[PDB]
């Protein structure tokens, strides 16, 4: 047993969205073993927060039209699916959005909660054309993992069914694109032994190092079945 | 014989599923058979899934 474990070397953070993570030294074959097995957990299993429910005043359904607004309500919901939000303490937070007068309604117009951080404040939600026009809505962000559609969610729970509540497809998983490479390490005299560059392309919320830590945790917890139980 | 009529309008939002017919513009038909998860799809060196 020559058990040779890698260690986290360097996290080249080019942006808050895109960041490279270098990993060495890996013994021959483990580069692609962790590479793909990690990529899979990082695509699908990562927890994140996403807009689940919206409730706009003067809106009975998502197909209707609101006066003084360039976007139809569907296109506003679409913008809220992709609204970068981080809840620190609770799993569910309902944020309030009131705003009026001529201007593109940005994410910063939402009232920030004590433990809620809006990651892209300049994110467009709606365009107000008339000065007279004002918009009011209640945006529910919940935390989950993967992708939970509004069609998967409109056929399970549905205990309270309040008319004027617009459900939205949840884009929970924070990782958008991910691709691991394998490169020379140039360590001691190993030659064979190399490193593993995991290039991550995520939203704002989940932090590159944090995310890889969580993904390694999920893999090891699934391996409990093959180590403990024989 | 008709006293009054009420016309109700529904809006269905049907997403794609296996069985839906798709095609290009060169007469290349086809039926979705399975929606493969993103994790399983082929990806180029750049990392971008097909």
Residues of B in contact with A199 (CB under 8 A): 47
Helix or strand (DSSP H, E) at A44: helix A30-44
Closest among A139, A104, A103, A108 to A121, alpha carbons compared: A108
Choose from B36, B38, B50 for mutation: most chain A CBs within 10 A. B38
The experimental resolution of this structure, in angstroms, equals: 3.8
The sign of the CA dihedral A26, A28, A33, A35 is: positive
Closest among A49, A64, A66, A65 to A136, alpha carbons compared: A66
Sole residue written with tokens 């509004």: A150
**Residues β-bridged to residue A104:** A127
Closest among B41, B2, B10 to A40, alpha carbons compared: B41
> Domain A1-47+173-230 belongs to what architecture?
2-Layer Sandwich (3.30)
Class of domain A48-172: mainly beta
Facing B47 at nearest CB: one of A44, A151, A177: A177
Give the whole-angstrom CA distance, residue A45 versus residue A200.
Answer: 15
Tokens of A40: 């899979």
- Sorted by where each begins, the domain ranges of chain A are 1-47+173-230, 48-172
Closest among A72, A118, A115 to A97, alpha carbons compared: A118
Structure obtained using: X-ray
With beta carbons less than 8 A apart as the criterion, state whether A102 and A128 touch. yes
Give the whole-angstrom CA distance, residue A134 versus residue A128.
Answer: 8
With beta carbons less than 8 A apart as the criterion, state whether A187 and A193 touch. yes
Contact A44 B37 (CB under 8 A): yes
Contact B15 A149 (CB under 8 A): yes
3-state secondary structure of A76: helix
With beta carbons less than 8 A apart as the criterion, state whether A174 and A84 touch. no
| A181 to chain B: closest CA residue | B45
Facing A178 at nearest CB: one of B11, B45, B47: B47
Torsion angle, alpha carbons of A158, A163, A165, A166, to 10? 90
Give the whole-angstrom CA distance, residue A43 versus residue B18.
Answer: 23
Give the whole-angstrom CA distance, residue A223 versus residue A226.
Answer: 5
């Amino acid at each position: 047993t020559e058990f040779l474990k890698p260690r986290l070397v360097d996290i080249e953070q080019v942006s808050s969205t895109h960041a490279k993570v270098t990993l060495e030294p890996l013994e021959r074959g483990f580069g692609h073993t962790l590479g793909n097995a990690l990529r899979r957990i990082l695509l699908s299993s990562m927890p994140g927060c996403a807009v689940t429910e919206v409730e706009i005043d003067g809106v009975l359904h998502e197909y209707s039209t609101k006066e003084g607004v360039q976007e139809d309500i569907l296109e506003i919901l679409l913008n809220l699916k992709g609204l970068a939000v981080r809840v620190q303490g609770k799993d569910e937070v309902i944020l309030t959005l009131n705003k009026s007068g001529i201007g593109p309604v940005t994410a910063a117009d939402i009232t920030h909660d004590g433990d809620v951080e809006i990651v892209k404040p300049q994110h467009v939600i709606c365009h107000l054309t008339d000065e007279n026009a004002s918009i009011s809505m209640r945006i529910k962000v919940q935390r989950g993992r993967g992708y939970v559609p509004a069609s998967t969610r409109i056929h399970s729970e549905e205990d309270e069914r309040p008319i004027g509540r617009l459900l939205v497809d949840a884009c929970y998983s924070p990782v958008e694109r991910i691709a691991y490479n394998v490169e020379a390490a140039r360590v001691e005299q190993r030659t064979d032994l190399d490193k593993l560059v995991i290039e991550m392309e995520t939203n704002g919320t989940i932090d590159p190092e944090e995310a890889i830590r969580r993904a390694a945790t999920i893999l090891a917890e699934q391996l409990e079945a093959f180590v403990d139980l024989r | 014989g008709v006293l009054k009529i009420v016309k109700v309008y529904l809006a269905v939002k049907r997403r794609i599923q296996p069985g839906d017919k798709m095609a290009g513009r060169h007469g290349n038909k086809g039926v979705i058979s399975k929606i493969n998860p993103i994790e399983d799809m082929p990806y180029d060196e750049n990392g971008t899934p097909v």
